[PDB]
């Protein structure tokens, strides 16, 4: 419960309509949570894809920042102000490793399954290889696998993780009955933001295009 979770999933129908059903260019921005509000705008995305982590474990995993420890960040498109996906980190610095895990990733209702998630993986990739981490791991409930792996994520080989094993038992955040799964920044290809960008219709980017950390 502080280092042990379990996917739940909402179950409550959601209404896919598209709410890039519009025309023109939907503007969008990338930000990092550095204040209350934005903090509750995020809680309030997740909490509308999972039933666990509950309310209280929302509070407890969206922070603001302390390189090192707790991130989340966003996409906010413009026109609207709504979050349309959102991911929340940990980076770790045990001995020679350095390395991030991802607790919570979501896509809002009416944005799913056009291409933000791919987006928004890459920019952690992009940040992770542009900061020193050497891999992003994932604890991944059964339902999560087929999502991380598209992503191309993979499971983590036994000898790697035991390399860590120890570390990650107290200090990570275990999903119940997961699968750990990993990828290592140097096989990330240095266009990959660029080509899910382009994958992602109707969107153009304002600001920065990726993650900052300030
Ligand atoms: C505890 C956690 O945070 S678990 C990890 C995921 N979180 C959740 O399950 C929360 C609820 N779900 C969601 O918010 C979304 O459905 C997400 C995050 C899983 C997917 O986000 P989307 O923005 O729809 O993903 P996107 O459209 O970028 O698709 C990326 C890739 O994943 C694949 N994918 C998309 N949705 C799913 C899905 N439900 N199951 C499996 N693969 C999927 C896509 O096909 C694509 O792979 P491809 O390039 O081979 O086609």
């Not at 025309?23 to 666990?52: H, K, N, W």
């Not at 045990?94 to 009416?110: C, D, N, R, S």
Request: aromatic fraction near 14%; charge should be neutral.
């Amino acid at each position: 419960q502080l280092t042990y979770s379990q996917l739940v999933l909402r179950t409550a129908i959601q209404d896919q309509y598209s709410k890039l059903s519009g025309d023109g260019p939907f503007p969008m921005a990338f930000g990092l949570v550095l204040s209350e509000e934005e903090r509750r705008e995020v809680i309030d995305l997740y909490s509308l894809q999972f039933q666990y982590p509950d309310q209280p474990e929302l509070q407890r995993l969206v922070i603001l920042p302390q390189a090192k420890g707790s991130y989340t960040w966003y996409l906010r498109s413009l026109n609207t102000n709504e979050m349309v996906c959102a991911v929340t980190i940990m980076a770790h610095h045990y001995e020679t490793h350095h390395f991030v895990e991802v607790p919570l990733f979501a896509t809002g209702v009416g944005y799913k399954k056009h291409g933000f998630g791919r987006l928004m993986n890459a920019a952690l990739l992009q940040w992770c290889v542009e900061t020193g981490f050497e891999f992003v791991m994932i604890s991944a409930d059964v339902k999560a696998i087929p999502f991380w792996s598209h992503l191309g994520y993979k499971t983590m080989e036994k000898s790697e993780l035991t390399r860590i094993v120890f570390y990650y038992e107290h200090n990570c955040y275990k999903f119940k009955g997961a699968e750990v799964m990993i990828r290592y920044c140097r096989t990330w290809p240095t266009d990959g933001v660029k080509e899910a960008l382009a994958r992602v219709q109707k969107v153009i980017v304002s600001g920065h295009v990726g993650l900052m950390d300030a």
